[PDB]
Design a protein around this ligand. Sequence first.
Ligand SMILES: Nc1ccn([C@H]2C[C@H](O)[C@@H](COP(=O)(O)CP(=O)(O)OP(=O)(O)O)O2)c(=O)n1
Ligand SMILES: [Cl-]
Ligand SMILES: [Cl-]
Ligand SMILES: [Cl-]
Ligand SMILES: [Cl-]
Ligand SMILES: [Mg+2]
Ligand SMILES: [Mg+2]
Ligand code: NA
Ligand code: NA
Length: 326
Amino acid sequence: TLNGGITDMLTELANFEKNVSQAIHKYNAYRKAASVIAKYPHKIKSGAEAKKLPGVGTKIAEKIDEFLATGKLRKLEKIRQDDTSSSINFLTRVSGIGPSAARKFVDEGIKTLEDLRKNEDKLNHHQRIGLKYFGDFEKRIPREEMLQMQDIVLNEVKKVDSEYIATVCGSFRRGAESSGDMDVLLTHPSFTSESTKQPKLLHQVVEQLQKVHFITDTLSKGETKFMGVCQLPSKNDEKEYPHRRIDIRLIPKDQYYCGVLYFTGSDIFNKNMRAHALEKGFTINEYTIRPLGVTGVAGEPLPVDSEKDIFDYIQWKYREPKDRSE
DNA sequence: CCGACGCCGCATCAGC
DNA sequence: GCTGATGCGG
DNA sequence: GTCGG
Ligand SMILES: Nc1ccn([C@H]2C[C@H](O)[C@@H](COP(=O)(O)CP(=O)(O)OP(=O)(O)O)O2)c(=O)n1
Ligand SMILES: [Cl-]
Ligand SMILES: [Cl-]
Ligand SMILES: [Cl-]
Ligand SMILES: [Cl-]
Ligand SMILES: [Mg+2]
Ligand SMILES: [Mg+2]
Ligand code: NA
Ligand code: NA
């Protein structure tokens, strides 16, 4: 937190541009600046010093100078004062309300938590769940609770079929001391890039977790991705744990390493690695790394037997998950 | 100066 | 129904 | 908003 004041400023700017301006590239520009400053190992003393970093340009350098001189940014002070912007920013904090729905709601005069409750009939299913658990979804998950959740998921998956492999990814696999949610990568030998020899592979796992009352609600569910809600069991007389977001990704077993690279993140790390891949003539998704032809169309998948193989193709030194939290 | 900015699953809607 | 575009979030 | 060519 050497530069926490500056990085906070940039994150609030990114959030404004995404939620209010609906300018996604400015959102990513600010987040990239925040990320490169967050790993800068000195306490930044000037905008000129910051502008040396890749992704900090003239405009952000000027803002950093204003912030360093005064402790504030007038642009943000004005934004915090604006009723419509503040209302749109707030509504997007509900899971399932994005910038478009938030502005639509605010236009209809729906601007507060109380307004959302009174107008629950105007919400789709995802948004209704996000409003129901708004408070809980604001709380972090201590790693100690992540470890308990991991134990339940891995044991329940094993009971369905001992040939499943479940891997907790996301910030947890990066070693974080707390997480916003739980991300579970799932494989089964019957599901590969070549064939699907069994149906309902994800369904069966979801059903087992619902059966033991771990999964409590479903936000979305398809053949390979589940997004929903779970809760640790509590003891007699003890307050219930907060409800938590969980999302599960079933990945073809022969594409495990591309999948665990993707699901480990961070999101900014994935964007930077995939951008570097492109510069090196490759494209990376959660399934494959493919070379780009002379016209730039993806070729055939390249052999991959470890995460490190993917780094080697694009000429990056390997980075352990804990060093991927960008 | 300017185009390019990672890549994709699921829910929902419009148009047919 | 299906396809394609869009919103949202992983 | 930033940057590479
Ligand atoms: N825009 C995105 C978003 C996510 N991903 C990948 C990388 C991320 O780590 C994983 C889980 O996302 P999550 O949304 O769960 C974020 P995570 O890194 O797990 O941190 P927490 O806030 O503690 O959950 O999904 C991506 O590639 N592109
Ligand atoms: Cl933009
Ligand atoms: Cl401020
Ligand atoms: Cl792979
Ligand atoms: Cl692919
Ligand atoms: Mg996560
Ligand atoms: Mg997640
Ligand atoms: Na720079
Ligand atoms: Na939201």
